[PDB]
Amino acid sequence: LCELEQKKRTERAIQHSQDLWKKRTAAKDAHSEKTPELYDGPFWLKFWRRKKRPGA
RNA sequence: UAAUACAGGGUUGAACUGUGGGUUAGUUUCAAUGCCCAAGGCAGAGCACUGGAUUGGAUACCCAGGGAACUGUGCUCCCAUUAAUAAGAAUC
Numbered sequence A: 001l002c003e004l005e006q007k008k009r010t011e012r013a014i015q016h017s018q019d020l021w022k023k024r025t026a027a028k029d030a031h032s033e034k035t036p037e038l039y040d041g042p043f044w045l046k047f048w049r050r051k052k053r054p055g056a
Numbered sequence B: 001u002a003a004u005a006c007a008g009g010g011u012u013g014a015a016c017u018g019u020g021g022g023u024u025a026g027u028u029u030c031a032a033u034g035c036c037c038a039a040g041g042c043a044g045a046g047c048a049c050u051g052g053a054u055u056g057g058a059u060a061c062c063c064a065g066g067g068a069a070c071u072g073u074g075c076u077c078c079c080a081u082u083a084a085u086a087a088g089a090a091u092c
Helices: A002-031
Strands: none
16 A cells, blocks of 8 residues: 555656746746846935934 | 046846854044145135224224135044944844
8 A cells, every 4th residue: 555655646746846847947037038127216315314222 | 417448336137155244453544624845826706914984982894905725646633523313133
């Protein structure tokens, strides 16, 4: 009984891993083939100064 | 603070790396204005200085002239000392 349970479990993992790797690399390929996005939003002029805990 | 040359910082994409760190002297750069020295000049401005006003008893307020001070690879940090009054980690 244990021989069949272990053998079947191995096949399920092999197929699942193959599909996961295929999609993982597909996304990275697209990112490395497009023009970088240049930021054009509001500047960070108010985030410079902070107000931490007063006193000690 | 349009053009061009040299070299930094910030945002995003891939690869690599696989705990590399926080604070910091017997330490080291930079640092407005003023002053000594030096280089200087032919513009726009003005401290000192007899150059036209004072008073209800005293004056630099209101014009004009006016040879110091205003670009430094230097000596150099006294101040109301340059983007708040904490250099870091955790709770969204």
